[PDB]
Every structure is written in structure tokens, then in C-alpha cells.
From Swiss-Prot, chains A, B:
Gene Ontology annotations for the cellular component aspect, listed alphabetically: plasma membrane; sperm flagellum; sperm head
Residues of the full protein shown: 72 to 1191 of 1325
Function, as annotated: Electroneutral sodium:proton antiporter that regulates intracellular pH of sperm along with capacitation and fertility. Activated in response to egg-derived chemoattractants, couples membrane voltage to sodium:proton exchange and transduces membrane hyperpolarization to cytoplasmic alkalization to cAMP signaling and ultimately to sperm motility.
UniProt protein name: Sperm-specific sodium:proton exchanger
Name of encoding gene: SLC9C1
Species in which this protein is naturally found: Strongylocentrotus purpuratus (Purple sea urchin)
Family per similarity comment: Belongs to the monovalent cation:proton antiporter 1 (CPA1) transporter (TC 2.A.36) family.
Region of interest called cNMP-binding domain, as start-end residue ranges on this chain: 813-895
Binding site for 3',5'-cyclic AMP: 870, 872-873, 880-881
């Protein structure tokens, strides 16, 4: 059979690709040129040696179908799949203008040249096929350099996206003109041509979109089956192309492009193992396709093409190379007035790279082989193949090698001083670690006599990269140094999962954009562009909710019944539109019986709802459709004008009333869009707030100048406050979406720490490897089920807020008491709930709204639902520390200090209510104190809070003296009250970090300021 | 074209497999039965609806070639690839006996039944095809249960290996009898039949072995190219099959089996990413093959088979099911007298599982489809397909579901108390961690109002599994508790890379075997089976080294010349054996010119070496071959008997002398085999020593009974000492191999810690993600280059040992001094180098041999090259602490205390020589002290040593008082000398762990016992 033999030839191609790719890794020329050389050699061998000709001929040629329907889909999908979708969408308008118009203009100009330069006397359709071939690109070799050098990352994204769209549209143009040349048909009317344009250009992406959304839907519902996900992705990728191109005659390649982009975007719905597998799998297929195409080009160019090449063809080829380079540069320059004003903009030297980086590749060669096959004996196939191969070789030899020197000359290969210094520091760190390990290993019993001259050489890692004027100098130093601290903070937040990858990239992009620009800091108005939702979706949401504003089984039954009955309707009316004696009778009978049994909705609803049945708007349509069907059924017991109008009405009216059930789902879709935008804005805002709170502890130990310190601290806080206000406003604008976004991240954090506990048990050897996977898989299934959480969650009632406060969360009997003794208060904008210095009246738990707080230790921040205000008012029993003002309509539970005192004095079990309240206060006191001692040591706020979570209040009043052992402790904070050192007799009367040299403490009955102390176990 | 359509059908199969696999996950029946049902439905549809018949018929049938040459290789290779090779090799004799003989006996018995039960009147060849089909297996559904239950892991390995070999040999038997039935040929002679048997049974595995070794060779030389590795593996896998089955007519399937097993074994030569990709890729292909085969079976069984099935065929099918189950059980029982005495043995209930677990699968169905296609219109194809499908369905419905209940009834589904308790503890740990994180999250500003009723329910992980008599009870408790501590230690050593995976599995197997057996502890003689090298390779090594015992370019030129000239020789003599006028003349001329130019070896060597040229043995053959060629060339200037003998001699003599160059490489091969065995033994011994040294610190805090304590401590040390002796002996037996094995692990440890430093910088955000990958890739390329390190490394000279001692390793001027003042001593067995209580004479650095040490703090251990003996003899200047005796011929550098005192008093820079010596002493003192405080806390010895590596000696004598701050320190050990507490005035005169409550220390001029103190920075 032929299939084993083609697999054999594919494996031969595999090994030749391996050889070429391995040996010429040193040399600058890419391996594809070596594959062309090998193809040429194999061609001459198979020509002069018939013993191998008769074997190889059977596989040496490829039908147009295998090219256009296997190779091109693979290449185009792999290109669409490896792309970073988000930056592409960020630059879509620029990349799409450049691709879709530059392709047309470049192909037209190339076709004009091919008619006027070459003596081949081609007509315009042939020249346009030629231009479409010569306009394809393959910059995989250049985007790699732009990624490695790191400079102008947006340029790499733009070039790659342009290549993707350019290749897709080039294939479409080729498919048109190939038909006009090799499969001519009679002149179609303008209307049919317009429909054909819409079929290829508009139906394609829409078909891809539909299949992509269906595929991601199903992928979101598969668990513990990597094979099913992989298989579904592959089957969808091929069926999209085949059904599009063959059955629908819709542009398959564009649908495949859209499918790749969408599936890449929705990567969160795919388990990570399947993600990495799919990336490597499509890379492998693209590699095989490239090797096969290049070797086939060499073989057939020696066998069939070069036998008909004249001395003038080489001159034409050189002129063509110059012409296409000039055309591409001219196109880019001509659109520069537009591209400069959209997306990323376009620097001159970026335009130079984009011109020079236009490598041609496998797509053009595959199209040239299609032409060569279809042309048969005509010279046009040989001319096409020769010129395409010549251009490919010239670009891969000249451009693909000189691109590096061009990057150097234009001044872009220079790696920035920041990154160079970071690399040098990291290398020295690694080197010191190696030195330590070398010493230990030398000081060991078993490996004492290893040849260290070999080992030390073997491990050596080496560097890969090798007064007011003074006040402005120091200011620019501090500016860049602070932005570096912000970058570090954003990465640290990412690694623990406080940040989504997209939020991280947004923040890092804003930080590097702020670094290169003069006198700049991260602009809060550039962050606001995230959570400021575009009004389209809110508009739609309120509209649909307005539009949607008797047992449960009835509507389920009727909604099923519509789907059931539409099949008879369409079956009959399509037949009547197209044009068994029992079948038409059976269809009419089915219509009549359906109309009869529709009493179970019509009259049942009329009687159940009573006279007011018609008040509900949709029941009016329910009556109307029955009225129409009654007449058009009664007619049967009594012409063209009857039937051709009934076939309109009895279809149209029956499908319409399904929208009543459809709207609730579109509401969910709008909610999902709003949820995604709100979640991204929330993540970036929270990340920025935390980054400012962390960098605002580092700067006090990192700039000396006590004027630059104040200016940077002011810029930091004036940025922070706007965000903390706006995030509070977002909740009020869209409550339930925010509630869902909060619950989701809560679960995510819990699951991450559960995985870390599992890995700790695994590394400690307390849990088997096979048991570790079994637990981890449940962790992952829960994590994936997070993606299917409702996009909106109903906000909890206030009693559920009381039920969940950290200190209330315990005894049901205490919760019942607090229900029995509480009051609910409501306040308007600008009402001030708390003043400084007033005596304690009770505790406030805010259940709605946003409040601003102010007071000297200043403290200008805000609080929101679930926060408790006046925490120690009944513990310390002293004048208020701060003022609280309503920034919004605010609702709180107020429980009087008289109400507290009873429970305070009565709930005295070992998990004491006073103990719980003081611990809630102590964590808040302790966190800044721990940070001020460790922010430069590298911990984040959340690890600080988890570290303090293990701690407990010191059980004083057993006796008023204590000293501790570090074998049972690791940190101490004095929260409140008066204490004094047992050795030095120095008093401590402040919230203080108890330094680790403080040996022994003693206390006394300063009854107004009684002590509390907090300690952490190892 | 046909290829796009077959891809479409494959994608349809993909989606049906996805549906069946997803929906029936709850139900017990496997999805393949659902695929058969779907195939049946599709068959009846395509039968009664010609509109889809005309479309589907083109793909519905499959040629025998696509089955036998695509599907079967894929299935067999995937089976061979997923297998754990090492346990399979450990049980190979048992599994191979059972597979290769049970297959023959079962197929013969089934064929006899098929002749005698069925009225089909088959001949013996047809019945043997039938038996070969019915003897195939597919236990993938049962080995999964045996892996999940964890009981009888060896049984899972045995069943899986039996299936692999059984399927391979069944395909071979089928290929024989299919030829005899459907492609008959004339009766061959017995000799040709014997050659055919050798061609199928012996040449197959050898061809697979050759391709496997070549493939792993090339894979060992590829770096930073995952695609090349993947591509080469796939190309090799298919070319092995194709070249074997088609060009060589050698059994392809067996070669594929051997290739899969070998490539799986050599996984260390493949980058891990390529490993996981290949596993998932072959799983995917096997899944596709299974789905396609089952659906095709359903389609064709409805279209062609069931139309010719009678009421008696069902009775035959049921009788056949019973018969094959009985036959398999009988075979297993009959071989039980043999299988019980080899490999794993065979428990009765294991035999019951193996009988009931014999699921049939895709291989039998594919062979049945081959028969059905070849039979054409004959009833035999329908009978074969019907019976095969019936057996498959019966086994998948009955056996595949009842296997779980059988495992329960026989008493194997019960999970052991140890694992249940471990799971309960791990679950409670995870639950407590979730509780902590829940509390913190509640005590947070941003997520305060998340619906915790949703979150807490969402994250909940749940348990998956739900007096002398008293002295013996306590003894069995301590025995099992110690073995559990050993298991933990072996896992902890693995996670940091002190152990190879195989060494870990050896130790864990020995630990669990020792746990289930009564009154048992890990037997040192079971560890010895690792490093006790079988004598074959040492024998070969010495033999080849004996056999192998004038400018450099000459031999390179001649070794190339032999390879060059053999091509003319073979080209001429094959032609003369087979039977251009210029070509034969040119060949003779080439022979004569080669003989003439061979003067450049013959006479050049004779003159260069002189008269004694003939003394070297190989020069005698060099002269002999020239003598023979001279006569047979001179003949041309003067018949059959001439030519047919010259064609023997002038070939044979020319190839022989290449063995002189070949032997040096075979020496390397033998060295590699010895290296692998020695390395595995070394790893297991070192792991056992460290495990005993760690568990020997835990037991003092883990058993109360001070008699069971002594007995277990004695069993531990008496095991340890034998290993520490034998590992010392191994070095002397095979020096350079041991040196290479030491250097390799040194580099491995350094690279692991370098990777950890990189990940630390990455997590701290100090290094970019893209920079982190760039460094990590260099780390990985170095790690992979470790695999190509020489298998033997020449032992360093003594001056290189002096050059590398931890304290000598510094100033070149000090090294020069030590060269200037040193002495080298040699000692025999039983000479005692050091006695207790003698005055200091100097320091010993051992450069060769093994010495035993003894002394009260007892200390009964050994030391080896690179160890220094008498470390503080010139520091403390007091009577010796211990006795040292030569266990072997021993050589040491002895440098007199008089020689020390000068350098001690002169090398006083900041990196003081005395400082370095005291630090070398201090680490040795400090390590046990840190372990005794932390062994139960979970640290290993190596993390202890790395922790101490950061520490330094306290710079006393600035003033004799000090106190420290934990913000600059983390641990303290007092090494030697006299100190006293500043507050309590208590003296300290012992090597002591300075507990963290010790605030302040003071010292004094007790000149005989001056103090040294060691502290660790954070």
C-alpha cells in the first residue's frame, strides 16, 4: 500500500532535517537552505539513476489537494497558535491595516512588474497569482532575534501578526486567481461576486469563531482526561478547515486562523499539560511540513524547472528580488502616516527591520508547487517554481544572515545597563553558591577524592552578555530605582498568585513605559483604562433586564415542545419549497395534533392565571400565534398565494417565541463580559495598591535625600488613594459581579496553599508519591471548576455578614446573642459616624457603602463591607483614635458598648471572646511592624500575614513575668499596654517590635493601659 | 483526494471516542463497548441509507496493509513504551516463560477445540490462526486497578509484560499461518524453515537492539533541540518496523518491542520534556487506533458478519468463552511449579487475577479484520470476525466489570493500615492549613465580604480512603516504626538528588519486603547484590587489556585507508560472485596501486622501528597480509580455483586487522557496563549509610524501652559497618571507575544547587523570567553533558591531593611550602599508624588505602583518600583521641608537627591558616550537634552541612566577651575550650550546642584549653 511508503519518505525527511538542523547550528545560514541543497542532490540522483527513480517517483510529486488541504492548514494553524494573542489584539488595528492593505498593494505592484518586466506575456490573473505568491512571508527567524534581544517587543508581535494575516489573505487571493486561470467558468453577475466575497471574507472568521466557542465550551467541562482534550482540539482544528473549504465552500484558512487565536486566548480552559503538549505537537507538525516542502522544492526544481531556465531568467530573478524589497519598504513608508497614529506607532528603524525582515518561506513554495502541478506541461509552472525558489534562497541567504548585523548597525543589539547589571549580579550569586557547595563537597567522607579540577571547570557558568544639577541627577536615580522596586513587587505578587498573568503584564508594561519616558511615574489614569468598563455591555444588561422583567414543569415542557415541533415544520416547508403520500398526510396530521395539544399551554395558562392572563406581554403573542394557526389550519377543511404565505408565517411565528427563553442566557453572556473586564481591573488595582504599600516601606531605607524622599512618598500615596477609592466605587456599580470576583480569588488562594501543603508533605516524605498525585488531582479539578463559577453571585444578607466575622465566627450561642442585641443604622453622604476623642459608644460593622478614615497615629484611607470600625473601643475604653466619614450611602450594624460589655464579661471560655477580639486587633497592629523590619528582606505582605496567623496572644495574668525560648518561638510583637525590661528596667509603652535580644519582660497593674503581647511559634 | 477524507473520518472517530469516554465514566463498562455499539448503529445506517453508504464505503474498509503496518506497530510500541522496564527485567525469566510457552500451548489447545467443537471443518492452519487471535490480550484496564490499589505491584508488572510479549508472538504466529492459508507456496526444505525461524525470532530483536543503540547514541549528542529528539525517535520507530518487515523480511513487531524497551530504559539520554511529550504522544496514537478499530469492527460486523450467523454460532461463542478461560487458568496452574521457583513467585490468588484479567483487545480485532478482508466471500472471514468480536464483548462486559468485585472477594482491595493512617494525617494537615488561610483571608481588606459559605464548601478536600508478650508487641512496633523512618529517609534523600530513582526503588523495595516478613530488618547481604559485580566484565576487561598491551598521523591515515579500500574489494568480489570493461580494469588498477602505496605503512614502519619491527605481534600480520597479496597480484602478470580462493583471502585478511583498532573501543564498552553497575551499588550503599546515620539519631527520641533501643541501635550499626568497609574495598578493586563515579555526582550536586539559586533569584524577582530560562538552559546542557563523561578517569597524583585539601586549597605560597616540607609514608596491612594518648607528631593526609579508627568519645569507622587524620593534633597539642589502624595497604603524606608549627606561626593573614584548620575541625564537630537537635525536625545531613557552610569562627581575643543579635545570627556551636555564662557564671567545657537562650559568654586564659566558638549568619 501507498501509506507505509509515504510514512517511510516522511521519516527520511525527518532524518535529513535532523542532520541539517544539527550540523549547521554554528553557521549563520538557516537549515532550510541545506534542505534545498539536499533536495537538489536527491533530484539529480533520482534523475540519473532509474533504479531509485522508479521507487521515488511514486512519492516525489504531491497533488494540489495534499498541499492546499494538509500542509497549508498545518502551517497556518501553527503560526496562529504560537502567537501571544493579547499583544496582537492590542495592536490589531495597526497590524490589520498593514496586512490587509499592504498585501493588496504589494501583490498588485508585483503583478504589474511581472507583466512589464518579464517577456513571458502573462495575463493579469497569472501575474496576480505570482504577486500573491511573492507577497507571503515567514519571519520566524527574525522574531526569534527580536525576542532574544528583548528590545522593541511590540515590534516582534507586530511582525508576527502581520505575517499571519498576510499569509492567510495571500492564500485566499491565490485560491481566487488559481480558479480563474486553471478552472475557468462563465462570467458571473456582480451580485454573485459580492456574495462570493462575503462567503470567503466574512463567513470564514465567523465559522471559525463558532467552532472555537463550541470547542472551548466543551473543553471547560472535561476533567482528568488529557487525551480527550488533545483529541478534541485536533479534531476541531481539522474539521473546521474541511467543513469550511469543502462543504460550505467558506474560506477554511481564515477559520483556522480564528480558531487558533481563540483557543490560544482561552488557554485557562485547557489543563496546562494539554497546553504544553499542543504547543509542542503543532511545532512538530510545522517542522515536518517545512522540511518536506523544501526538499520537494529542491527535487522538482532540479527535475523539471532548471531544464527550462535561460540566462535571462537569472537577471529577472535578481531584478525581482530588488523590486519586492523596494515595494515592501515603499508600502510601509506610505502607510507610516497612518501607522504612526495608531497602536504602537512605528519608529523609522523599526520600519527598516520590517522591510529587511520579510523572509519568504514554506507557504509561497507550497503555492508555487500547486501552480507547477496544475500547469502540467506549460512553461508557466517552471517559471513560477524557479522564481519562487530563487526568491526564497536569496532571502534566506542574504536577509536571514545580515539581519543580525543590521540590528547591530541601527543600534538595537546593545543590551541595556539595567539588564546587564542584573545578569552580572545573578552570575556572581550563582558563582558564590557554587563555591559554597564546592567547599562542602570537599569536606565530605564519600566524595573527598573527586578530581576537583574536572568538576570546577565542568560547572562554571559564565556571563552570557559579556546642587540643582546634582539634585536632578539624584532625582532621576531615585525615580528609576523606585520603578525597579515596583517591577520586583509585581513579579513577587505574580509568583504567589495575587496577580493574573495579564494583570502582571499590564503593570510591567506601564512600569517600563514609565521608565523610558522622562520625569515619569506610573500614571493612575493609565491603570483606570482597565476597570473603566465601556458602556455597551451595561447598556445591554439593563435593556435585557428590562425586557425580561403555572407549575415549574410547564415551561420546561413547552420549551422542549418548540424544539420538537420545529423539525416537522422545517421538514414540510423545505420540501414544499423544493418541489410519501403517507408522509405529507402524517406531517399535516402532526401539525393539527400539535395545535390541538397546545391547549396544555394556551387554555391551561388562561385558566391558571385567570382573567389577567393577557396582562403579561408574552401571553399576547401566545394568543396571536394560536389565532393565526387556527385560520391556516381551518382552511384545510374548506392555492399558491395561500401556501407561499403560510410557509412564511407558520415558520416565522413559531421560532420567534423562543427568544423569551433565550434572553436569560444572553444576560449571562453580558455578565460574563462584564465579569472579565471587572476582574482584570480589580487585579491590576489591587496589585498596584499592594505594590505601593510595599515600595512605600523600602524607600525609607533606599534614598538618603529627605526632599526626594517626601516627593516620591507623596507621588506614591496620591496615586494609591485614587485607586482605593475607585475600587470601592466599582463594587457599588456592579455588586454581584464583584462578589463573584472576590469569592473566586479566595478559593484560588486556598487551593494554592493546599497544593503547597501537599508538596511540603511530599518533600518531607510523609506522603507517598502516588498519594501526592491523587490529592493534587482533586486540587486541580477544583481549580478548573473555578472557571465555571457563576459570573454573578447574589450579595449575602447582613445576618450572613454577622455570621462570618473573624471573631463572631465561632459559638452559635454568641451569634444568637449578637442577633439578640444589635442595631442596624443607615447614613447619607457626608455624615460623619466617628469623631476623634469621643468616648466609646460601641462597635460598627459596615454592611454597605464606603467610608473614609482620618487620624494622627495621616491614616487617610477607606474601609468597606466586612470591616469593623472601633475594634478596641470596648477593649481599651478610651477616646477615639480617628475620624470616620461616609464617602457614600452607608449602612452598618451598631452594637452598643453597653451591649458589648455583657458578652465581653460572659463569654470567657478558653477561646475567649476578648482573646479573639484582641487577636484581630493584634494582627492589624503587627503586620506593619513586621514589614518595616523585613520589606528589604524580601517578604510580601501576605506571607507576613500567614506568618502571623500561627501566632497567639501571650497568656498574661497567670503571672506578670515571662521569658521565652527560640526553640519554641520565632517572633514577638508588643501590641498595647505597659511593659518593662527585666534587666535594664526600661519601660515599653508603645506598639513595638520586641527585638530578639529582649530577654525578659515584666508587667504591672497600670489598669488604664493593661498589657497585651503577641508571640509566634516556629 | 482520499487523504483529507480519511482525516475527516479519523476526526469523527475522535469525537465519538470523546463522547463515549466522557459520558460512561460513571458506569462500570469500558467505553470501547460503547464504541462497538456506535459502530453497529453506524453500520445499519450506512446499510439502509445509500446516500451515506456511497460516501462512507470509501473509508469503511481497511486494507490488510494499513492494519498490519500502521495500527499494530502503534499499539505494540505504545505498550512497550509505557512499561516500567526495570521491574520487567527483574521478572523477565518468569514473564518470558509464561508468555512464550503459554501462548503456544493456549493457541494449540484453542485450535484443537476449534477443529473439534465447530462444524466449520477448518484445517489446522486456519484453526491455528484462530487460536493465535484468541490468545492475544489487553489488560490495560486491570493493571490500572492493580496500580491504584498498590497491593502486589509486581503482579501488575508481570501481567503487563506478559501481555506485551504475548501480543508480539501472537502477531508472529498469525503472520506465519496467514501466509500458509491465503498465500500458499511450495513445500520448503527443513533447512530453509530453520533459517526462517531464526529470521523471525532472532534477527528481529537484534535489529531492534541495533537501531535502539544507534538512536540513543545520537540522542545523547543533541542539545537545545526538543524537536530533533522527538522527530528522531518517531522516525526510528517507524523505520525499524518498515525496514524489518519489508526490506529484511525480519519480524518488525519484535524489533519495535525491543526498541521501545531500550529507549524507555535509556530515558536519561532524553531531555525530560521530550520524555513526557513522547509518552503522551504514543498514548494519543494508541487511543486513536483503539477507537478506530472498535468502530470498524462494529460497522463491518453489522454489514457483513451478522448476516451469516446462525443460532448455533452463539452456542459456540459461549462455549469458546468458557474454554479459553479454562485454558488460560490451566496453563497458569500447570506452569505454577516452575513460576513459583523464579522471579517474584506466584501466589494462588495472583494466579486467579491473572486468569480472570485476560481481557482481549484491539490486537485480536485487527487480526480478525485482516482475516475477514483476505477471506473475501468465504464464510471463514465472517466466522472469525463474529467469534472475535463476541469474545471481546464478553470479556469487556463480564471480566472488566467483575474484576473489582473479585479483587474485593479475594481480599486485596483493603488498603493497609499504614497508608490509611498516613492519608488521614495528611488530610488533617491540609484541612488545618485551609483553616489558617480561611482565617487570614477573612482578616483582609479586599476580600472581606466574599461568601465564605461558598468558598469553604468549594475547597473542602475529603479523605479518599473513607512482660515478654508485651515486649514482643513493643519489639514489632519498634521494628516497623524504624523501617518507616528508613523509608522516609530514602525519600528525603531522593528529593534532593543523593539517590538515583533506581537506587531509591531498590532501597524502598528492600524496606517493604523487610516490613511484611516477620522478625526482619533490611539485610546488608541483599544490598550487596548491587555492588557485587559479576565476573564476566572484569574477565573481559583484563583479557582485552592484555591483548592490547611512527608519528601520530600514520595510524589515523591507515585506519581511514582500510575503510576506503574495502569498498573496491567488496564491489569487485560481489560482482565476481554474482556473474564495465573499464570498470574491472579500474578495480584491478586500484588494487595494484593500493598495494604499491601501502609502502607508506609497511616499509616506513620497518625503517622507523628498525630491525625490531617484527617484535610487535601485529606487525607480523602486517607482513603476512602483504606477503599473500604480493603473490596474488604477481599472478596477474603470469582459473576458477585461483579466483574463488583469492576472493576468500583478499577479503578476510583485509578486514581482520581492523580489530586492532576496534579493541580499544570494546574496552570502553566494558568499562561502561562496569561503571553502571558500580554506580548503582555505590548509590545504594551511600544511601543506606546515610539512612542509618539519620535513623540512628531519631530512635533515641522514638522508643522508650532501653533494651529495644540497644538491640535496634546494634542492628543498625552492625549493618552500617559492613557497607562502609565494602565501599572502601570497591575503590581499590576498580579505581578509575570509582573516581569517575565520584566526580559525576559532585558535578550533579553543584548543578542542582545552581538551579536552586536561579529559582531563588527568580522567585525574589531579582532576575527576569526570560533571563531565568536562559541561565537554566545552560544548567541543563551541562547536566546532559554529564552523561557523556568518560566512564573511567585516571586517578590524580598525590600532589593534586595536596593541592585540593579544603584548608590547603588557598595560597600558592602555602602549597609550595607544604611541598617543600612534607614526607610520604607507606604501610602494610595491620600496621597501626596512631595510638591513643600519644603526643602530637604531625598530620596525616591519606593518599591511598583504607584505615579503621577506634576510640572513646566507639567511633568504629573507616577513612579513605582525602581524609586528614590528626586534624587538631597541632592545634590542641594534647594526647591523641583515637587509634587508627591500616585495614589495607595504606599510603599517606606525613608532615611533622615541627613542620606545621612554622607555617602555623607564619601564615597569619586574614584568611588565617589556623582559622581554616579550626573551621575544618568545627564543621565536623558541629554537624552531629546540629543533627541531634533537628533530626526529628526533618533536616537531612547535607542541608545541615550547607547551613553550617555559611558559619564562621568567632573572632575571639579581640576581647574575651561577646553577645549576639539574632538579626545577624541564626545558630551557635561551642567547638572547644573553656567558656562560662556571663549571667549564671556556669562554666562550659565541652563541645556544646549553645542553646538560643544563652545570652552572653566570657572567656579566660586557660592556655591549655583555649576557646573556639562557631556562629551562623542568617
Amino acid at each position: 500500500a501507498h501509506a507505509p511508503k509515504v510514512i517511510v519518505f516522511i521519516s527520511g525527511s525527518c532524518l535529513f532535517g535532523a542532520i541539517s538542523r544539527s550540523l549547521f547550528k554554528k553557521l549563520p545560514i538557516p537549515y532550510t537552505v541545506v534542505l534545498l541543497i539536499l533536495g537538489a542532490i536527491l533530484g539529480v540522483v533520482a534523475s540519473n539513476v532509474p533504479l531509485v527513480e522508479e521507487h521515488t517517483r511514486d512519492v516525489a510529486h504531491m497533488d494540489p489537494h495534499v498541499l492546499l488541504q494538509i500542509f497549508l492548514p498545518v502551517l497556518i494553524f501553527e503560526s496562529a497558535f504560537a502567537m501571544d494573542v493579547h499583544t496582537f489584539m492590542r495592536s490589531f488595528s495597526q497590524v490589520c491595516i498593514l496586512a490587509l492593505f499592504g498585501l493588496v498593494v504589494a501583490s498588485v505592484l508585483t503583478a504589474v512588474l511581472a507583466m512589464n518586466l518579464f517577456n513571458y506575456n502573462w495575463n493579469f490573473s497569472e501575474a496576480m497569482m505570482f504577486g500573491a505568491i511573492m507577497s507571503a512571508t515567514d519571519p520566524v527567524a527574525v522574531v526569534a532575534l527580536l525576542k532574544d534581544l528583548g528590545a522593541s517587543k511590540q515590534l516582534g508581535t507586530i511582525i508576527e501578526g502581520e505575517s499571519l494575516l498576510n499569509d492567510g489573505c495571500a492564500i485566499v487571493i491565490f485560491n481566487v486567481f488559481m480558479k480563474m486561470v486553471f478552472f475557468p467558468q462563465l462570467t458571473s453577475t456582480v451580485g454573485q461576486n459580492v456574495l462570493y466575497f462575503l462567503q470567503v471574507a466574512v463567513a470564514g472568521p465567523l465559522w471559525g469563531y463558532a467552532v472555537a466557542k463550541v470547542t472551548v465550551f466543551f473543553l471547560s467541562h472535561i476533567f482528568n482526561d488529557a487525551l480527550v482534550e488533545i483529541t478534541i482540539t485536533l479534531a476541531a482544528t481539522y474539521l473546521t478547515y474541511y467543513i469550511g473549504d469543502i462543504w460550505l465552500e467558506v474560506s477554511g484558512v481564515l477559520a483556522v486562523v480564528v480558531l487558533g487565536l481563540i483557543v490560544n486566548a482561552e488557554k485557562t480552559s485547557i489543563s496546562p499539560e494539554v497546553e504544553v503538549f499542543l504547543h509542542r505537537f503543532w511545532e512538530m507538525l510545522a517542522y515536518l511540513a517545512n522540511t518536506l516542502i523544501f526538499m520537494m522544492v529542491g527535487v522538482v526544481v532540479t527535475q523539471k524547472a532548471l531544464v527550462a531556465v535561460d540566462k535571462m531568467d537569472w537577471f529577472y530573478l535578481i531584478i525581482l528580488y530588488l523590486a519586492i524589497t523596494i515595494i515592501r519598504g515603499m508600502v510601509i513608508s506610505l502607510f507610516s502616516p497612518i501607522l504612526s497614529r495608531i497602536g504602537y506607532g512605528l519608529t523609522w528603524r523599526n520600519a527598516v527591520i520590517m522591510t529587511w525582515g520579510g523572509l519568504r518561506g514554506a507557504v509561497g513554495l507550497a503555492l508555487a508547487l500547486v501552480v507547477e502541478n496544475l500547469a502540467g506541461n506549460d512553461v508557466i509552472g517552471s517559471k513560477f517554481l524557479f522564481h519562487t525558489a530563487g526568491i526564497v534562497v536569496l532571502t534566506l541567504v542574504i536577509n536571514a544572515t545580515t539581519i543580525q548585523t543590521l540590528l547591530r548597525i541601527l543600534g538595537m543589539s546593545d543590551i541595556s545597563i539595567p539588564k546587564r547589571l542584573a545578569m552580572a549580579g545573578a552570575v556572581r550569586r550563582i558563582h558564590e553558591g557554587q563555591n559554597r557547595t564546592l567547599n562542602m563537597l570537599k569536606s565530605d567522607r564519600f566524595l573527598a577524592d573527586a578530581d576537583w579540577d574536572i568538576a570546577t571547570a565542568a560547572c562554571e557558568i559564565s556571563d552570557p552578555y559579556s546642587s540643582p544639577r546634582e539634585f536632578a541627577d539624584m532625582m532621576e536615580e531615585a525615580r528609576l530605582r523606585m520603578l525597579k522596586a515596583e517591577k520586583i513587587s509585581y513579579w513577587k505578587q505574580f509568583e504567589h498568585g495575587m496577580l493574573a498573568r495579564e494583570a502582571l503584564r499590564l503593570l510591567v508594561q506601564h512600569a517600563e513605559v514609565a521608565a523610558d519616558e522622562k520625569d515619569q511615574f506610573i500614571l493612575v489614569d493609565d491603570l483606570k483604562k482597565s476597570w473603566q468598563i465601556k458602556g455597551i455591555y451595561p447598556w445591554l444588561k439593563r435593556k435585557l433586564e428590562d425586557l425580561i422583567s403555572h407549575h415549574m414543569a410547564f415551561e420546561v415542557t413547552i420549551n422542549i415542545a418548540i424544539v420538537l415541533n420545529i423539525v416537522p415544520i422545517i421538514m414540510e416547508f423545505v420540501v414544499q419549497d423544493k418541489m410519501l403520500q403517507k408522509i405529507e398526510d402524517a406531517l399535516r396530521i402532526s401539525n393539527y395534533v400539535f395545535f390541538v395539544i397546545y391547549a396544555i399551554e394556551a387554555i391551561v395558562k388562561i385558566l391558571g392565571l385567570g382573567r389577567h392572563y393577557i396582562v403579561s406581554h408574552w401571553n399576547k403573542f401566545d394568543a396571536f400565534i394560536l389565532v393565526v394557526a387556527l385560520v391556516d389550519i381551518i382552511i384545510a377543511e374548506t392555492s399558491s398565494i395561500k401556501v407561499v404565505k403560510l410557509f412564511r408565517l407558520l415558520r416565522g411565528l413559531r421560532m420567534l417565541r423562543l427568544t423569551k427563553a433565550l434572553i436569560p442566557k444572553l444576560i449571562l453572556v453580558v455578565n460574563g463580559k462584564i465579569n472579565n473586564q471587572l476582574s482584570l481591573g480589580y487585579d491590576v488595582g489591587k496589585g498596584y495598591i499592594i505594590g505601593e504599600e510595599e515600595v512605600g516601606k523600602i524607600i525609607d531605607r533606599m534614598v538618603d535625600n529627605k526632599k526626594i524622599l517626601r516627593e516620591l512618598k507623596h507621588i506614591s500615596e496620591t496615586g494609591r488613594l485614587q485607586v482605593v477609592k475607585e475600587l470601592g466605587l466599582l463594587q457599588r456599580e456592579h455588586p454581584g459581579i464583584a462578589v463573584s470576583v472576590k469569592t473566586r480569588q479566595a478559593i484560588r488562594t486556598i487551593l494554592n496553599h493546599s497544593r503547597e501543603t501537599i508538596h511540603e508533605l511530599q518533600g518531607a516524605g510523609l506522603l507517598d508519591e502516588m498519594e501526592a498525585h491523587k490529592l493534587e488531582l482533586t486540587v486541580e479539578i477544583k481549580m478548573k471548576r473555578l472557571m465555571n463559577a457563576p459570573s454573578s453571585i447574589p450579595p449575602p444578607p447582613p445576618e450572613n455578614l454577622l455570621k462570618n466575622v473573624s471573631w463572631l465566627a465561632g459559638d452559635m450561642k454568641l451569634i444568637d446573642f449578637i442577633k439578640a442585641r444589635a442595631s442596624l443604622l443607615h447614613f447619607d453622604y457626608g455624615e460623619v459616624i466617628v469623631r476623634e476623642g469621643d468616648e466609646s459608644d460601641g462597635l460598627f460593622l459596615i454592611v454597605s457603602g464606603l467610608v473614609k478614615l482620618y487620624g494622627k497615629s495621616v491614616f487617610e484611607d477607606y474601609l468597606t463591607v466586612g470591616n469593623v470600625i472601633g475594634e478596641m473601643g470596648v477593649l481599651t475604653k478610651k477616646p477615639r483614635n480617628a475620624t470616620v466619614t461616609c464617602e457614600t450611602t452607608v449602612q452598618v450594624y451598631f452594637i452598643t458598648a453597653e451591649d458589648m460589655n455583657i458578652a465581653i464579661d460572659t463569654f470567657t471560655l478558653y477561646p475567649s471572646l476578648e482573646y479573639r477580639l484582641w487577636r484581630v486587633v493584634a494582627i492589624r497592629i503587627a503586620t506593619p511592624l513586621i514589614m518595616e523590619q523585613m520589606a528589604f528582606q524580601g517578604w510580601t505582605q501576605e506571607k507576613v500575614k500567614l506568618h502571623l496567623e500561627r501566632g497567639y496572644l501571650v497568656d498574661l495574668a497567670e503571672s506578670h513575668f515571662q521569658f521565652n525560648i527560640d526553640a519554641t518561638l520565632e517572633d514577638v510583637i508588643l501590641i498595647n499596654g505597659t511593659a518593662y525590661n527585666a534587666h535594664t528596667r526600661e519601660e515599653i509603652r508603645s506598639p513595638c517590635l520586641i527585638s530578639r535580644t529582649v530577654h525578659k519582660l515584666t508587667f504591672q497593674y497600670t489598669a488604664t493601659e493593661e498589657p497585651r503581647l503577641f508571640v509566634v511559634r516556629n
